[PDB]
Amino acid sequence: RHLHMRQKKRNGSLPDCPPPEDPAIAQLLKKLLSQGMTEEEEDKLLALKDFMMKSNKAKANIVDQSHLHDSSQK
Amino acid sequence: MSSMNPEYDYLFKLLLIGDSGVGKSCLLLRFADDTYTESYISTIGVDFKIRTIELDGKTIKLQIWDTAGLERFRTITSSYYRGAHGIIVVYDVTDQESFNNVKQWLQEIDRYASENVNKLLVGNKCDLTTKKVVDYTTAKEFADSLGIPFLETSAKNATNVEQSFMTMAAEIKKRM
Ligand SMILES: Nc1nc2c(ncn2[C@@H]2O[C@H](COP(=O)(O)OP(=O)(O)OP(=O)(O)O)[C@@H](O)[C@H]2O)c(=O)[nH]1
Numbered sequence: 001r002h003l004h005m006r007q008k009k010r011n012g013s014l015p016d017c018p019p020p021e022d023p024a025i026a027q028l029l030k031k032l033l034s035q036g037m038t039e040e041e042e043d044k045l046l047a048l049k050d051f052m053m054k055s056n057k058a059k060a061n062i063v064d065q066s067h068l069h070d071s072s073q074k
Numbered sequence: 075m076s077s078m079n080p081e082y083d084y085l086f087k088l089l090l091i092g093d094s095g096v097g098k099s100c101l102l103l104r105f106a107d108d109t110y111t112e113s114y115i116s117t118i119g120v121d122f123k124i125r126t127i128e129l130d131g132k133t134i135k136l137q138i139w140d141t142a143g144l145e146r147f148r149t150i151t152s153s154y155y156r157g158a159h160g161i162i163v164v165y166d167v168t169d170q171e172s173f174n175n176v177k178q179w180l181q182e183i184d185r186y187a188s189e190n191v192n193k194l195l196v197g198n199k200c201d202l203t204t205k206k207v208v209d210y211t212t213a214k215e216f217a218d219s220l221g222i223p224f225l226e227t228s229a230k231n232a233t234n235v236e237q238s239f240m241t242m243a244a245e246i247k248k249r250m
Contacts, residue, residue: 035207 002029003042004049010039082126082135086246087157088239091179092164093172094143097198100229101164102140105239110230117142120154127243134243152186160192160242167197167226168205173213180220192249194242197226200233 002025008014020026045052066073090098099117103109106123122139141154155161163179165172176195183193195217197208210226217224223241227234 031209 003046006042007046010042082133084132084247085135085137086159086243088136088138088242089154089158089161090138090140090164091161091182092143093166093169093175094145096143096164096166096169096172097229098140098143098164101162101196101198101227101235101238102138104229104232104235106138108232116144118144118147125239127240129240129244129247132247134247136239136243138239152182155183155186155191158187158191160194160246161187162194162196162238162242163222164196164198165208166199167208167213168199168202170207173197173208176216190249192242192245193220193222194238194245195222195224196238197224198229200226201228201231 002020005014005017009017020029090102092098094116095114099115099121100110102121102123103111106125117140119142120139122137125136125138127134127136139154139158141152142148161183163176163183165176167173180193183191195213197210197213200206213226214224223245225234225238225241227238229235
């Protein structure tokens with residue numbers, strides 16, 4: 001959501017953009033940008049939005065099953 | 075009572091462990107020989123250097139051991155930990171995998187080292203700020219979560235290198 005709003009500011013579709021509201025988002029934004037996140041990678045990340053969201057939700061759902069196999073991971 | 079060498083009161087065997095390329099040999103060389111070099115020779119088995127230091131007026135002899143970090147020269151059971159007074163776990167602050175494997179190095183300590191051996195997490199290569207991946211807060215949270223002291227360092231620039239080993243020597247004296 002924050003990145004999508006930054007896209008609107010980047011493409012001239014919004015006047016200006018405030019910093020994220022929850023510090024965990026600013027901490028992540030800081031991490032991403034300080035690691036060399038180019039503006040084109042922000043656009044590409046936003047195109048992968050649906051994939052990353054669905055996939056992250058599915059990865060979490062497997063972690064919700066990792067309690068059933070906690071003994072075999074050792 | 076026991077015999078006591080006139081030159082040194084305490085013999086503290088230190089040991090360096092961690093993934094390959096984290097800078098264990100560089101840290102050992104920078105501390106015991108004030109030398110650094112870009113030439114990488116993958117350590118095999120064991121190496122050690124002795125450095126004599128002084129803390130709280132006590133002459134402390136440190137025997138610092140550098141173990142091979144590569145997969146091929148490692149084994150499930152290890153007998154280098156046996157008799158170590160303190161163990162430094164090094165990781166490369168520019169490689170998250172070396173930091174992640176710290177969890178796995180710790181369980182080796184709890185299995186083969188002395189039951190209450192001193193531990194110290196060291197984050198070498200702190201000079202590569204443009205390439206660093208772990209946050210100092212990420213490491214501190216993890217080190218404090220286990221109560222192990224921690225010091226980010228750089229064998230290249232001597233940054234905190236001396237202090238890292240001196241801190242463990244002090245911690246061992248504190249333990250005994
Ligand atoms: N920039 C930077 N590079 C370092 C530093 N320390 C080590 N290196 C680099 O990493 C390479 C390997 O360092 P080593 O100390 O041999 O790594 P190691 O932990 O001993 O690896 P093994 O001997 O295989 O266990 C060195 O040749 C340097 O190029 C450091 O403090 N800063």
